[PDB]
Amino acid sequence: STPYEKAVDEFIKDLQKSLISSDVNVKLVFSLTAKIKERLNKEKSVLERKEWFISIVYDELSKLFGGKEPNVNPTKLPFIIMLVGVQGSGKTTTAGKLAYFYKKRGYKVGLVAADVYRPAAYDQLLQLGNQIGVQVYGEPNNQNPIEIAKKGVDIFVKNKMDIIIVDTAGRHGYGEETKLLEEMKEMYDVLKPDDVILVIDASIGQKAYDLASRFHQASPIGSVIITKMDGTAKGGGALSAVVATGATIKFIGTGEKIDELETFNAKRFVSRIL
Amino acid sequence: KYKTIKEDDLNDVIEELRFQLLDSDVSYEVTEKILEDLKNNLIGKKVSRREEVEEIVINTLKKSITEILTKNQKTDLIEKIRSSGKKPFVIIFFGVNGVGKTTTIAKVVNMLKKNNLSTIIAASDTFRAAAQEQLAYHASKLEVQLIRGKYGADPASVAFDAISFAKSRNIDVVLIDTAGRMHIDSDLVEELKKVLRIAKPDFRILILDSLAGSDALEQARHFENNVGYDAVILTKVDADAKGGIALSLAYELKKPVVYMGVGQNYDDLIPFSPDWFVERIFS
Ligand SMILES: Nc1nc2c(ncn2[C@@H]2O[C@H](COP(=O)(O)OP(=O)(O)NP(=O)(O)O)[C@@H](O)[C@H]2O)c(=O)[nH]1
Ligand SMILES: Nc1nc2c(ncn2[C@@H]2O[C@H](COP(=O)(O)OP(=O)(O)NP(=O)(O)O)[C@@H](O)[C@H]2O)c(=O)[nH]1
Ligand SMILES: Nc1nc2c(ncn2[C@@H]2O[C@H](COP(=O)(O)O)[C@@H](O)[C@H]2O)c(=O)[nH]1
Ligand SMILES: [Mg+2]
Ligand SMILES: [Mg+2]
């Protein structure tokens, strides 16, 4: 066992603990670190250089979700966004934050309240819309969320909105809620959105990979927004969700206020995860 | 006749157990301590020759986890309320954003109604969009009184009015909803402490999301240090979540989980049992 080989091994062992402690999916940590270990042994007489080791970690981790700064301005207009995610993850609030972000940039924005399950879901999004001056479409008496979604999109397209953002009910997709995944798929098929955004709580633990995978199989995830980054969570579970879907992380949420949304920064996020 | 357990006998099974606990969202640091406890309890112990070391290890762990949780159990909450001479018995619910406070309050109302206890709800989240409307829907469906407070009232004023109202009507229980807040948000932690000083609750419940990883323990630690609470309710266990936070809470903080939320309907609340937890994790 060469002094270098020993150095690599201890570094990889410490990195495994660090990533797991930050809530990256355990199996993922081992496969990721296996690739990193292989690189450290093949690339660069010399002994351990931690600085080079770390650079390879940042490199392999950055690959794991894209280097490029996210593009957050819509490709074509009108641009339909459908927000999805686990109960309480921050979807309704993030819809308001997104509407605010784009309005500030000079877009005509419409919000669609397509959650018919949560009490006062409509009232919540209407209040956010009222606060930031963005029109909200909803039908509090309608129990068909797809019909609301479609009618809302159609009206906003007709009236030449640039960006249309559809809020949907919370779901996790397990047990009875497998049917909610089917409903999400159906909404996806009907709206044909331009971006399906998985909105995910930064604090999410070891279920993240399998849960995000279930979502992706039902309706392909294009983008991810990580909420509650103003908290103490490292965010490794959110990283796991991103790897399961192949999606691009575009924004993080940094508070409850409507302006507390910012573009995702890969380097800082790696540093946060550690 | 009996073989002596050595460290080398334990290595393979300790690693399988480590990954099982980690997968169950028992945090890394707690998992390590528990397994170190396990190894130390077993190194030097005798065992029959045709007995499988691996099984004794697994059973010793299941038994230790069961004891850690069983020792932390307190009196049942309904029995606590019934035995209390206080009217109303005042309960407050707090925790970080989106974990499930408001919905859990509705389930608790439902459970209290089934136990023939009268209840009113204080709508003391006066910040978040539609927070009072959301509770008003549940209050109406559960047919219980919601106290919204005067127009523009702050959380403490709403709670004060709710308690005053319950006193004069001899209502058994007041349940106080509060806005989501980060455990590291000093201003909002102060807002909560202000409601506590004014409401002087008889029971304080932290809500934790069972889908949360290691941060759930961090939430629990910080809130215990800055605020203090009596018990935890874990939500969203129906998302195929193991709820390993339950073990970490007992092991690190000596705090019990009293109920678990297992869906979005009012009946979706079960009491916490050590045996149930151990079966979930190891089966
Ligand atoms: N501190 C903080 N709070 C946030 C952030 N994003 C959302 N929230 C808060 O998180 C809570 C849940 O938000 P909400 O929009 O209702 O989430 P949701 O996913 O629509 N819930 P549901 O699944 O029930 O429809 C709210 O208290 C909201 O203010 C964030 O970045 N930071
Ligand atoms: N599947 C499932 N969903 C749950 C459970 N408990 C709560 N929820 C859902 O989680 C979402 C958030 O619940 P809510 O009561 O608004 O949480 P909150 O902590 O009061 N949010 P806020 O911080 O904004 O006030 C809702 O969709 C609610 O129905 C549970 O046990 N299982
Ligand atoms: N009990 C009851 N709830 C209803 C009915 N129609 C809609 N809801 C509830 O209204 C809510 C959706 O409308 P709002 O977003 O406007 O609250 C959901 O909680 C839904 O269950 C009904 O006929 N009866
Ligand atoms: Mg919502
Ligand atoms: Mg609430």
UniProtKB/Swiss-Prot annotation, chain A:
Involved in targeting and insertion of nascent membrane proteins into the cytoplasmic membrane. Binds to the hydrophobic signal sequence of the ribosome-nascent chain (RNC) as it emerges from the ribosomes. The SRP-RNC complex is then targeted to the cytoplasmic membrane where it interacts with the SRP receptor FtsY. It is found in: Cytoplasm. GTP binds at residues 85-92, 167-171, 227-230. One of its GO terms (molecular function) is 7S RNA binding. It comes from the Archaea. Signal peptide: none annotated. This is Signal recognition particle 54 kDa protein. Part of the signal recognition particle protein translocation system, which is composed of SRP and FtsY. Archaeal SRP consists of a 7S RNA molecule of 300 nucleotides and two protein subunits: SRP54 and SRP19. The gene is srp54. Keywords: Cytoplasm, GTP-binding, Hydrolase, Nucleotide-binding, Ribonucleoprotein, RNA-binding, Signal recognition particle. One of its GO terms (cellular component) is signal recognition particle. It catalyses: GTP + H2O = GDP + phosphate + H(+). Belongs to the GTP-binding SRP family. SRP54 subfamily. Composed of three domains: the N-terminal N domain, which is responsible for interactions with the ribosome, the central G domain, which binds GTP, and the C-terminal M domain, which binds the RNA and the signal sequence of the RNC. The chain holds residues 16 to 292 of 447 of the full protein. Its EC number is 3.6.5.4. One of its GO terms (biological process) is SRP-dependent cotranslational protein targeting to membrane.
Curated annotation (Swiss-Prot), chain B:
GO terms for molecular function: ATP hydrolysis activity; GTP binding; GTPase activity; signal recognition particle binding. GO terms for cellular component: cytoplasm; plasma membrane. It is a peripheral membrane protein. It comes from the Archaea. Coiled coil: none annotated. It catalyses: GTP + H2O = GDP + phosphate + H(+). It is found in: Cell membrane; Cytoplasm. One of its GO terms (biological process) is SRP-dependent cotranslational protein targeting to membrane. Its main location: membrane. Keywords: Cell membrane, Cytoplasm, GTP-binding, Hydrolase, Membrane, Nucleotide-binding, Receptor. Its EC number is 3.6.5.4. GTP binds at residues 95-102, 177-181, 235-238. Belongs to the GTP-binding SRP family. FtsY subfamily. Part of the signal recognition particle protein translocation system, which is composed of SRP and FtsY. Involved in targeting and insertion of nascent membrane proteins into the cytoplasmic membrane. Acts as a receptor for the complex formed by the signal recognition particle (SRP) and the ribosome-nascent chain (RNC). This is Signal recognition particle receptor FtsY. It comes from Sulfolobus acidocaldarius (strain ATCC 33909 / DSM 639 / JCM 8929 / NBRC 15157 / NCIMB 11770). The lineage of its organism: Archaea, Thermoproteota, Thermoprotei, Sulfolobales, Sulfolobaceae. The gene is ftsY. The chain holds residues 86 to 368 of 369 of the full protein.
